[PDB]
Enzyme design. Sequence first.
Site, PDB file in Angstrom:
ATOM      1  N   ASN C  84       0.837  -1.196   0.000  1.00  0.00           N
ATOM      2  CA  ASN C  84       0.000   0.000   0.000  1.00  0.00           C
ATOM      3  C   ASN C  84       0.873   1.246   0.000  1.00  0.00           C
ATOM      4  OD1 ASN C  84      -2.360   1.704   0.156  1.00  0.00           O
ATOM      5  ND2 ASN C  84      -3.349   0.205   1.546  1.00  0.00           N
ATOM      6  N   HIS C 114      24.113   2.569  10.756  1.00  0.00           N
ATOM      7  CA  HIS C 114      25.262   3.469  10.761  1.00  0.00           C
ATOM      8  C   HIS C 114      26.080   3.213  12.033  1.00  0.00           C
ATOM      9  CE1 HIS C 114      23.939   6.244   7.488  1.00  0.00           C
ATOM     10  NE2 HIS C 114      22.777   5.710   7.817  1.00  0.00           N
ATOM     11  N   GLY C 141      -0.537  -0.694   8.781  1.00  0.00           N
ATOM     12  CA  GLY C 141       0.128   0.522   8.437  1.00  0.00           C
ATOM     13  C   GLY C 141       1.069   1.042   9.485  1.00  0.00           C
TER      14      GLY C 141
END
Lengths: 188, 188, 188
Positions: C84, C114, C141
């Site tokens: 989505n 990192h 989501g």
Amino acid sequence: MTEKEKMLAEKWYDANFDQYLINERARAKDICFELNHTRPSATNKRKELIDQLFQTTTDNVSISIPFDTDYGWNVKLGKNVYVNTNCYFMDGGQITIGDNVFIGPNCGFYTATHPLNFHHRNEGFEKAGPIHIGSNTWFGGHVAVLPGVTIGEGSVIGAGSVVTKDIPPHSLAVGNPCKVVRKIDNDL
Amino acid sequence: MTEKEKMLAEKWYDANFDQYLINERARAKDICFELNHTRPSATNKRKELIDQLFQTTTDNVSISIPFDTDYGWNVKLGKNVYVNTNCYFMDGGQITIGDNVFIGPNCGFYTATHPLNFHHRNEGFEKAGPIHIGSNTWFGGHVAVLPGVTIGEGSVIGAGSVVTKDIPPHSLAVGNPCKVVRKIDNDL
Amino acid sequence: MTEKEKMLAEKWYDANFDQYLINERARAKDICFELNHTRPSATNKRKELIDQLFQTTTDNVSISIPFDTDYGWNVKLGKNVYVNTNCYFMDGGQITIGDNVFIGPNCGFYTATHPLNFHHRNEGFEKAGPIHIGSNTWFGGHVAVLPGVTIGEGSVIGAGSVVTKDIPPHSLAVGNPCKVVRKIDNDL
């Protein structure tokens, strides 16, 4: 019942293969695409597109692009609704928004439930749970609201919240999961 | 005082109806729109747009599109600032970013406070709280930073964090709400 | 070893200055830009662009725009993968996605680490940690998945989750940090 009817009745429906629903999703997506590629200062064209998307005559509904929705006509909007950038109104289940509502950026209002069992899920079935956003509300950015949730009038939802349960009126609430902190005095 | 002056003084200001502020927001939005629709390999045009947006000559400020900001001129940037996709610098309150800063995707830096009382909020008043991002910092994706927050130099903020309070220098911090985990040894 | 080889071997590599990697990132970004500005109903052009981006012939991989990825060729996809709006597959470390996978909006799959020490970080070094997404999975989501994480087959990840550790198969899991709630019965 048609699959639209099942969708709107909180029944399991064939979200993936039903042709009317596929067509309606396509309509809204192409409108969103147009809106999202319209210059923000093109005030009249944007108003036209928004009204076409929601199938209504909006009253001071301000949408900062980009914006996304699944059907558009299943978002019911009050007046003076301010939607900041990159919001998604996933509206298989009706999303009802009151008057005087401030929605921060990157907020997602999700009405779709999929089956937990992958065999059923894989067949494309969904169940839609409406979201009710009361009038006189403010959402910070990066908020997600889950299916079937109601946020009461006069309430304030902090940035980053994941709203899994109903929030009573006149409440300040924050967190993942979102929990009431205290009441708000909203008197004149 | 003008509403801009009130904004910059951490006073309540009429964010919604003041014409100078409305105009400045419109300027930045149209620049962002142009930037967001410029091919990423159009290096010189992008640099031009970024410098126009921030009203400065940037030094190795890399912005991955899309990007959003409210005023642009109220984001103060050091050199070597790497901003990944879909960030929002909501800069009514000044956002100051140091040198050598890595900002992950979908990060939101929010300086706007609205009144809790909906009657005042509905009238359009806001109060801006500056955000200070130290040099030599790294933010994971999906981070939200709230108004008035300072993140000290040399600090690392984990993905998903919601930074509601100041984070001291040389700290590793994560969570919603974001909490220091431990110190970082940043010696040569 | 070349920097690509180091990247793919989970070694520290010079992500910022290596020319082959810079070029590959540029290729993918321009493809994404094209995709993101292609009308959603232009089915054949979108399929072409997606297949170009992932360097493969996809089978019912549906990508709702916008979409972002760093290399594209380092995302390995099964069939029937539904992505989505506004997802980011940060694929320096390989991202492997199984069959029948539902990815909600605003999900970020992050494979880049990192250095904690800013002196090393500032020199541009990164270490990539592959992400493995099992078949028959569903992500809500606003989910972020961190480097090196594996999400087992048949599992369901709630909206808003920040997945910092591996999630076993057939599990329902939610939260920041994401934690298993219970097992899912996935029998026929």
